[PDB]
Amino acid sequence: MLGDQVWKEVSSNTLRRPLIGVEKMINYAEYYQNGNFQLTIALSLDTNLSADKMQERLGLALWTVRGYLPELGTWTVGSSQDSTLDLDHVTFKAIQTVEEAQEWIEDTAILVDEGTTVSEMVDLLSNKRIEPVGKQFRAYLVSQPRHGKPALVMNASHTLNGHRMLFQGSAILQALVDARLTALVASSNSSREALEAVFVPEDISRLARKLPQSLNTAYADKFRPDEADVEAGFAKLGERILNSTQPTLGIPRFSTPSQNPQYTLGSANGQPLTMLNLRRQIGVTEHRMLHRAFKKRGSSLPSFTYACIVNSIDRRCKASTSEADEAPGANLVYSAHASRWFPAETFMSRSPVNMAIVPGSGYVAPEELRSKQRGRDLNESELFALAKTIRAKQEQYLESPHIISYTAQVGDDIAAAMAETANKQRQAGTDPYVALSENSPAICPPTLTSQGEVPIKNLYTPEGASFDPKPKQPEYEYIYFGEGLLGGRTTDASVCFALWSLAGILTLQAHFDSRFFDAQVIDTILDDVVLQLRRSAASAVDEAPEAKL
């Protein structure tokens, strides 16, 4: 009941709950750091729907999805009665009229102008903060690109989202070909007339049970921690604090931000697009081979990838926080998903946890990341040993959910310090990019978040959603997606590596602002990692050729 009681009726048709934990930290970063962490995901579509059909169905599709996913209509920036800005709560307004519903549809289901490509949309959206501040989700239909395939492009705040956006997208794609929606559009003069037929005023009593809750309240409710549980979480907090001070290798940022960034995605508003997502994609067949080859070594694709990132940063940058006479270690900065401790029902329809990230920490000792024989030039055996070390340290850091016992306190501390720092920087007239970088470490530690394939249905027909191969022989209206694109947003002076899979396609990418890092160096590290993955896999498969099947 802690989950229900937390959303309180605060006005006639408005629910409100406090933000708690990582979600509160994220909300403050999005406000004070120009949309830091915000997510853009494109689902690239093959479809025999005309652009015209998709355009006339999109708004009603989004409205239909909102009916069972009211999470799409939440809001996280408001005020109190005393004027003051409020970053500490999430609110939900239950829509009571057709006009209000139509307003929300037209603000949230965007038809992109003829010509703009999916890649251009991902670049544009990942290079700015969502507006108005507080808005949590927007869907863009790119139905008439001048080249490339059409796509559903979603832009979301990270405060209440993550993995969940793929399911939100899947629901929208299902609605676009739903037989009942198609009949509605066919029988109505307009979207507004259709809406007028099927509109039901939203009921805060029923919808409260479907709105997202903090991981922290789901944790309290499911695990009911006692004092020993709290003690175990406090120990994992001490670990993260100490690891953040130990000598570490990493990628050095510019001492001062670049005023003429030389790597951009073009220019919009007259200003360069400097938030970059450098990507390496691995196809379905090669992905399977990599996955099996590293299992044959007793390793895993995510941990071996981390080892290669750590080693390639070491070799390419030769940058550390320690002295020259002292080999550094590696501070591991990574995220973990709470599904490792919570059942799948935690992430479904009843009070779902829609942002389930817990910060992870670990420290590779100097003797574990360098070889006595080869120094930084680790051979394949040594990289597998480093992978196993990294994996073991993550497994011990994450062995228990009681980490969550301190994320509310850490979230409060980071949020308060961010607001106080931002107010001080404003009063001092600090340049905005200097302000986003001066508090960042001169050396960015190796930062990799790894995501297993999320099983999202790939085929949508009037009979529903299914898992199937790309249509060779369409029998009805259908939508199929065979590839995704991620645009992460990192506005502070850090480099974030992301490893993820969608539709069997493996993507390794780095996102960062080129005002703060040499993009050529990051590009070289990504190339090094892919080369090491392929060479180590080929050697593993040479010893065990069965791993090719």
Contacting positions for Cl ion (CB under 5 A) = 162-163, 356-357
Min dist CB 347 to Cl ion, Å, is 9
Q: Which of 331/335 has CB closer to Cl ion?
A: 335
In the complex, minimum distance from the CB of residue 340 to Cl ion, in angstroms, rounded to a whole number:
12
Nearest distance in Å: CB 162, Cl ion: 2
Q: What would you measure as the largest C-alpha separation in the chain, in angstroms?
A: 77
Q: Which residue has the CB atom at the shortest distance from Cl ion?
A: 162
- The smaller minimum CB distance to Cl ion, of residues 163 and 370, is found at 163
Half-sphere exposure of 409 (CA within 13 A, CB side): 9
Strands (DSSP E) found in 197-270: 249-252, 267-268
DSSP 471: P
- In terms of CB distance, is 321 or 335 closer to Cl ion? 335
Among 59, 92, 63, which Cα is nearest to 354's? 92
Q: How far is CA 243 from CA 142, 228, 387, 500, in A?
A: 44, 23, 18, 26
Give strand ranges (E) for 286-337.
319-320, 330-337
* Residue 66 vs 163, nearer CB to Cl ion: 163
Closer to Cl ion by Cβ: residue 151 or 357: 357
Nearest-approach distance from CB 161 to Cl ion, in angstroms: 7
Q: Report which residue type is found at 137.
A: F
* Beta carbon of residue 222, minimum distance to Cl ion (angstroms, whole number): 17
Please list, in sequence order, all residues whose beta carbon lies within 8 angstroms of the beta carbon of residue 263, skipping any fewer than 6 positions away.
274, 276, 514, 519, 520
As measured in angstroms, the least distance from the Cβ of 355 to Cl ion is: 5
Of residues 190 and 349, the one with the C-beta less far from Cl ion: 349
Structure tokens at 340: 């490792």
* Whether 456 contacts 343, CB under 8 Å: no
Shortest Cβ 215–Cl ion spacing (Å): 9
How far apart CA 535 and CA 277 sit, in angstroms, is 25
Pick between residue 61 and residue 357 the one whose CB is nearest to Cl ion. 357
469: cis peptide before it, omega within 30°? Answer: no
Give every CB contact of residue 375 below 8 A, 6+ residues apart in sequence. none
Instruction: Write 91-94 long-range contacts (CB < 8 A, 24+).
Output: 91/10, 91/14, 91/15, 91/16, 92/7, 92/14, 92/15, 92/16, 92/204, 92/207, 92/211, 93/13, 93/14, 94/13, 94/14, 94/15, 94/70, 94/201, 94/202, 94/203, 94/204, 94/207
Q: What does the block give as tokens for 26? A: 């994220």
Question: Nearer Cβ to Cl ion, position 327 or 456?
Answer: 456
Q: Closer to Cl ion at the Cβ: 354 or 536?
A: 354
Contact 491, 511 (CB under 8 A): no
Residues β-bridged to residue 145? 115
Q: Closest distance between Cl ion and the C-beta of residue 354, in Å?
A: 7
Q: How far is the CB of 280 from Cl ion (least distance, A)?
A: 23
